[PDB]
Amino acid sequence: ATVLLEVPFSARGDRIPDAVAELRTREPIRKVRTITGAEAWLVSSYALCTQVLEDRRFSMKETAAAGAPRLNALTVPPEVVNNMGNIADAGLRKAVMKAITPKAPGLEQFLRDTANSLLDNLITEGAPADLRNDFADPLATALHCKVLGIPQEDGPKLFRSLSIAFMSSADPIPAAKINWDRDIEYMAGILENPNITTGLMGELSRLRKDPAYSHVSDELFATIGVTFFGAGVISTGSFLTTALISLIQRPQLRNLLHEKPELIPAGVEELLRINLSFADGLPRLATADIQVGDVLVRKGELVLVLLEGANFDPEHFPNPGSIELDRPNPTSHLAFGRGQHFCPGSALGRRHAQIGIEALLKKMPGVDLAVPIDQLVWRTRFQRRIPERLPVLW
Ligand code: HEM
Numbered sequence: 277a278t279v280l281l282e283v284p285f286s287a288r289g290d291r292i293p294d295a296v297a298e299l300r301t302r303e304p305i306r307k308v309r310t311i312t313g314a315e316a317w318l319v320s321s322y323a324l325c326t327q328v329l330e331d332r333r334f335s336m337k338e339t340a341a342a343g344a345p346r347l348n349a350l351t352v353p354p355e356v357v358n359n360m361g362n363i364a365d366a367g368l369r370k371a372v373m374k375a376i377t378p379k380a381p382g383l384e385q386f387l388r389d390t391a392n393s394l395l396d397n398l399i400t401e402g403a404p405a406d407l408r409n410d411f412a413d414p415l416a417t418a419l420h421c422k423v424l425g426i427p428q429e430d431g432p433k434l435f436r437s438l439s440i441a442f443m444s445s446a447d448p449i450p451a452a453k454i455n456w457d458r459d460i461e462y463m464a465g466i467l468e469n470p471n472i473t474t475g476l477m478g479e480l481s482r483l484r485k486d487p488a489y490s491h492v493s494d495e496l497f498a499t500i501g502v503t504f505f506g507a508g509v510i511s512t513g514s515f516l517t518t519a520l521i522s523l524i525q526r527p528q529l530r531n532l533l534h535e536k537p538e539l540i541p542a543g544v545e546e547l548l549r550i551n552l553s554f555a556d557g558l559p560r561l562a563t564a565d566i567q568v569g570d571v572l573v574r575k576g577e578l579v580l581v582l583l584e585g586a587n588f589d590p591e592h593f594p595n596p597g598s599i600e601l602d603r604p605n606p607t608s609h610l611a612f613g614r615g616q617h618f619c620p621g622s623a624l625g626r627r628h629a630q631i632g633i634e635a636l637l638k639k640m641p642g643v644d645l646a647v648p649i650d651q652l653v654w655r656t657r658f659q660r661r662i663p664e665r666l667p668v669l670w
């Protein structure tokens with residue numbers, strides 16, 4: 277006798293399990309068991325993943341309802357699952373989105389300068405270097421302090437909340453609440469700090485004192501800072517880290533992008549397509565009975581949208597495991613989601629990776645892993661797939 281198929285399948289972020297392709301072919305929507313013991317529908321084809329993400333009756337907000345089948349325990353207050361809705365309802369969506377584009381004057385130069393400084397320090401210290409803890413994550417942290425308008429020196433403490441905040445746990449996590457409450461208090465103080473006049477927090481601080489926002493809660497303003505720092509830093513740092521592995525594993529591509537840096541945007545788009553950074557399918561709760569392929573999903577059931585199911589689907593991306601810079605549908609992947617909850621930071625995430633890769637290839641054109649790839653330690657029970665250390669030489 278066999279147990280119901282368990283998710284997630286593998287915490288390894290350097291390769292897709294052969295099992296995903298078999299599953300997509302045989303059962304592109306299939307029942308699975310999550311780490312909480314809940315049942316869920318796992319969707320793994322491009323067509324069905326898109327259908328779910330574009331139908332708001334598959335609700336993000338409702339996943340936080342008491343008594344719902346859960347993918348994992350909440351690590352934030354339940355109302356924060358509706359963060360973007362709360363921002364929109366407060367009239368802040370346009371301002372928040374404008375503050376997190378890569379377009380502010382000086383931002384791209386700051387990114388380049390930071391990347392080059394991190395890499396110079398690694399070169400001075402000598403190989404081996406850890407490209408996650410000493411390059412990709414500090415680059416993400418520094419970027420997000422700049423985008424938020426907060427002091428660079430405050431970045432590391434906020435960053436250290438994230439190894440817990442983005443856990444994928446069967447049970448509530450006491451440390452997540454301690455760190456959340458502290459980080460909210462920090463952002464509330466930022467909003468009261470007259471020196472904070474730039475970036476997202478500088479803009480929110482002004483809007484907070486504008487009559488058109490006088491009934492928006494101080495809690496929401498602080499929440500925007502905590503959430504955009506956390507989501508952005510974990511997502512950009514984790515994506516860049518695993519993208520560097522995929523690049524290092526492809527010397528011909530590394531060399532092509534080093535020789536022709538104008539191809540880096542196309543390369544990053546393919547690295548996004550093949551990225552395994554999200555450790556679990558994206559969760560949604562059905563708010564009606566909805567046909568998805570051969571399954572009638574019932575109201576109240578949990579649906580998990582497997583991004584790599586869509587992104588490696590050969591019916592949409594032929595030769596899906598290959599990085600090809602000339603595809604006709606290159607941004608049509610689901611790395612940033614799709615529909616109501618499409619990533620509001622997509623342009624910034626692209627530029628973070630493009631600048632980080634450009635700087636790395638210029639400074640370390642001979643970059644290579646310093647350990648066999650199987651020696652990387654993949655973090656478990658986390659909402660991203662990342663190697664604990666990424667040891668390289670050059
Ligand atoms: C390459 C880096 C990134 C990747 C791969 C990525 C991926 C994603 C994905 C897949 C979603 C959709 C989640 C869902 O539908 O359930 C999402 C949402 C989100 N992302 Fe990004 N993201 C990245 C960068 C960023 C950055 C730089 C920020 C902010 C500075 C950010 C903030 C958010 C927020 C706040 C949401 C939630 C939107 C919502 O609930 O409606 N992300 N991201």
Ligand SMILES: O=C1N[C@@H](Cc2ccc(O)c(I)c2)C(=O)N[C@H]1Cc1ccc(O)cc1
Nearest residue numbers: 352356357358359360441502503506507659
């Ligand atoms: O904006 C938010 N929208 C939703 C949806 C969401 C869930 C998980 C993700 O990875 C992403 I991207 C988005 C949420 O539930 N929360 C935030 C992100 C956040 C920020 C700080 C935290 O500590 C935890 C989660």
